[PDB]
Write an enzyme that holds these catalytic residues in place. Sequence first.
Site, PDB file in Angstrom:
ATOM      1  N   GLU A 172      40.346   8.197  14.284  1.00  0.00           N
ATOM      2  CA  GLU A 172      40.011   7.469  13.061  1.00  0.00           C
ATOM      3  C   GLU A 172      41.154   6.554  12.605  1.00  0.00           C
ATOM      4  O   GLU A 172      41.249   6.207  11.433  1.00  0.00           O
ATOM      5  CB  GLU A 172      39.623   8.447  11.939  1.00  0.00           C
ATOM      6  CG  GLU A 172      40.711   9.424  11.568  1.00  0.00           C
ATOM      7  CD  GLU A 172      40.310  10.405  10.462  1.00  0.00           C
ATOM      8  OE1 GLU A 172      41.076  11.358  10.218  1.00  0.00           O
ATOM      9  OE2 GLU A 172      39.246  10.232   9.828  1.00  0.00           O
ATOM     10  N   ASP A 174      37.488   6.147   7.451  1.00  0.00           N
ATOM     11  CA  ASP A 174      38.936   6.081   7.657  1.00  0.00           C
ATOM     12  C   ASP A 174      39.276   4.988   8.645  1.00  0.00           C
ATOM     13  O   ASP A 174      40.237   4.235   8.454  1.00  0.00           O
ATOM     14  CB  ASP A 174      39.491   7.416   8.193  1.00  0.00           C
ATOM     15  CG  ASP A 174      40.118   8.285   7.104  1.00  0.00           C
ATOM     16  OD1 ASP A 174      40.754   7.735   6.181  1.00  0.00           O
ATOM     17  OD2 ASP A 174      39.978   9.525   7.172  1.00  0.00           O
TER      18      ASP A 174
HETATM   19 MG   LIG Z   1      38.609  10.699   8.019  1.00  0.00          MG
END
Ligand SMILES: [Mg+2]
Length: 716
Positions: free
Chosen positions: A423, A451
């Site tokens: 991420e 993210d």
């Molecule tokens: Mg995350």
Amino acid sequence: TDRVSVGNLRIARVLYDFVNNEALPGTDIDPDSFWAGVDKVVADLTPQNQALLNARDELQAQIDKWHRRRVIEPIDMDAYRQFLTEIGYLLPEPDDFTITTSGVDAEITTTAGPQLVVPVLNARFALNAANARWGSLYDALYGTDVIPETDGAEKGPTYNKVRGDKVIAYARKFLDDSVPLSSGSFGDATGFTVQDGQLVVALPDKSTGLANPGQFAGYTGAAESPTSVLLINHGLHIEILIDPESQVGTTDRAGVKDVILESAITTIMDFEDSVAAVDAADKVLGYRNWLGLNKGDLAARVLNRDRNYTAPGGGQFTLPGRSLMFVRNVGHLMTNDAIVDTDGSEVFEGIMDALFTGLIAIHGLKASDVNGPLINSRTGSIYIVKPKMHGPAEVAFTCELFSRVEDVLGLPQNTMKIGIMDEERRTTVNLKACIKAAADRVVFINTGFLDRTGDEIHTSMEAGPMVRKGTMKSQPWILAYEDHNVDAGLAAGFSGRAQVGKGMWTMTELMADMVETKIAQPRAGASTAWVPSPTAATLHALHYHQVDVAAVQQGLAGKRRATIEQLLTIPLAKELAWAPDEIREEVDNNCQSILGYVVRWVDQGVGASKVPDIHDVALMEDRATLRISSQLLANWLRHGVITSADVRASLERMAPLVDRQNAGDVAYRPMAPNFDDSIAFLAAQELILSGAQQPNGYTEPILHRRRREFKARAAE
Ligand SMILES: [Mg+2]
Ligand SMILES: O=C([O-])c1ccc[nH]1
Ligand SMILES: [Mg+2]
Ligand SMILES: [Mg+2]
């Protein structure tokens, strides 16, 4: 103040007591050496942890500068990529390899199915997820919009038979598609019997067995008229409950009361983005719940026991009744005052988590009562998800950290398995090397939207204005990132060995849409994907029955579906791509995302809930929603798309909006009209206006501080 001295550490009393009184007893770890280990590990690993965080900063500065010294038509990818290799951002790829991780449970190596993520600070939710290994399919169809609420089929105050019959026929068709009869359909079944170890289904005119007799896994009650029938398909269990005397049973042609699906095969108990824990008290609450789950004694109201079955050939076995649990630690960034050193410096929260969630997890490898008998991992592993890492050096460090904790705990080496979250861009472009860094510990890689987009925005913050948040979901970089993740997984031999997972369905009420679209994820070779609720887990399970993930995985083997160029395609917006009202809508959109999430977090310490968006669609997002939205706005502010007056204006008319969306919440205190009095509001304002300055766009430094601020005000 109220701390305990252990070498260079000053441990918060609440934490010290909790560990001595609750966590340690039963582990046969000597309390004294446990704490000396905490002290040693913290002292040994803290500088490298910090060195890694500075590495992040050195790299970002160089990248900011590269864009700034440039004019420059569109970016030259040869140049950009050569630059990234010079500074050590883009590391060379290692030779092929197979992961060597072992001692892993079958739920992770083998079974493909839904995966729940739940805030560990919420005991009711956590128990629900753990119990969500099995769920009612009827309830899931009846209760959501999968069976549409057209004229006649409406959920009323009491049972609607038209709707109920629809539910039944939906399930019958699922049976046919999943566990087909030699001839006929379940829609015409009149009864079930187990005869000579076979399953026999009665049709109005004839009888038939299963096309694949081996899909019959067992039953309850007498073979001559079972109370239920157990089936299996693609590794997942299906159970037909039979009871003509039940409210739905009477209406059914074959007396079927419900169809139960094995749903949430695994669950992640979360200490990170779905919870709000800003100090020692908050951490202990979380640690305590994690402890109850592992000892089996958490009650809010208890954990389910395993399920009893009779084998087709007469015998007598058991199936797990609980979702197998991961825990998600926090990542490398944050510190927490649950422990400070002599100097008063907070200790790294990620390091503490490994020590305490690792300690706690020992109870899950042991008889639960303390007599018996539940357990988490039967193969002896502790399964930890580690979020927000940047590159293979950050992964190596997490492994070394686990190695050292295992030592303090007296566990065999590699007991602590890692779930590698992908991420962050520096991980994505070095994914193969990250997997190799954890080649003997890794049980999981996964992708997500929030993210990863935030990092995508922050990294190229200086390159120019980015596309809208909605546009981001289908940009070339993210589609390459999705495929590249599966490719790296499959190429390191994850098939048969470790999970390859995809992102959360955030729209909790839009189940019809989920059932319709989330099927893409297993078709893309993902052996697991994130769901927001036990109900969504049950519905997402249908996908794994329609899709042979194992075969899909075997088919992708050896393919390279994403180029480094694709991954490095910065989501810049074309030469002025938005009408004015489009700009305003996006700004409102993001400001509302932040306000709606921040207000619950700062005021009430809730890190995950059904938060109505700007169109009143319920979303269950986690803290990462703050990272994209504030980064997007910060980017637009940075490049002239909007003004600071624009931002303040948006915040001020979205605020009361959020107020009334939270009407019906007794503890809720509104932000409007005294904006500069609300700590929540000011937190929202700061995330945006300080956004381009947060390390990698991270929102916790600001959020944590404001939440601590609020807790202090409330203490008067
Ligand atoms: Mg995350
Ligand atoms: O949307 C997400 O990523 C999420 C995880 C837990 C709750 N929401
Ligand atoms: Mg098949
Ligand atoms: Mg910066």
